[PDB]
Amino acid sequence: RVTMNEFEYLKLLGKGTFGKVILVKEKATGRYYAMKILKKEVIVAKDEVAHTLTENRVLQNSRHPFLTALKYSFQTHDRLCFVMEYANGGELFFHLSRERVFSEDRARFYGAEIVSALDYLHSEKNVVYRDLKLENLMLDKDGHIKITDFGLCKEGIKDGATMKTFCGTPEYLAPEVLEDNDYGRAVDWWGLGVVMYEMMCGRLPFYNQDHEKLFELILMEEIRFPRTLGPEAKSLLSGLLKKDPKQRLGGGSEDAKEIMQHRFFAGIVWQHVYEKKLSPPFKPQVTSETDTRYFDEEFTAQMISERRPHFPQFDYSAS
């Protein structure tokens, strides 16, 4: 029911490895969205079909206040398109680069909302996000967390069901993934550990610009914290960043509940988090809907068979 013509392509938002994300206005209804446009030519050649298909199903089969919702997804003869809920506030990576550090309160707020989303994916959808990072974490117009980018998800993951695939972002990879032995939904909690370390300390817990040496630290090096950091934060970060996933906070059968119960999250009402009752400690100051203030200026300035097969059951529309 939806073609390329139906949208006004207004402003470039980003440009990943496999395609471009454009800010769009719907002609029929006037509301704004973010479109992920992917050339089939690339997808098939660069063996990305599987990820594309997992990302499509995951958006379709999820509805959470902190996951970007999919409106439509359609294909042309040559292109694949995900029409998504637009995140006005930009990436967390944007704001943290400018501010160096977030306060512990601000970190708790983002942390909780990411926990709420990841709990839902695990317990209710049997998904593991696998690719948690500052870039994949965006803010909506109010300043609530939106997790986008579902290309690296795994489906059909229940209890201690395990995976083998080496994927994610090198800086954020859990030790068990780097060891190349099986891993479960606990990799996400490692990932939460890393992003929350970044938020409260202003750096990755382990860093070298050489992937191999990077992985050396992730496997070997004992975690270290800034001397400013409070006891509750330090304990949570220690617990999330345990190298052995069976010792990790979140690593047991109780999954997300273990982290929710944690003293760092004391006084957080988890139902109120899901209902968005909590006051976002930062409000994006976007004037209009087309205000791309919080997206890196490098992007937001530019003008506009077997290689191109059909994608069975790709097209989707919501209620």
Binding site: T17, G151, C167, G168, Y172, L204, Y207
Partner: peptide, 10 residues
């Protein structure tokens, strides 16, 4: 500031 990261799969 740290550089932007790129996701991957084997």
């Amino acid at each position: 500031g740290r550089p932007r990261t790129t996701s991957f799969a084997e």
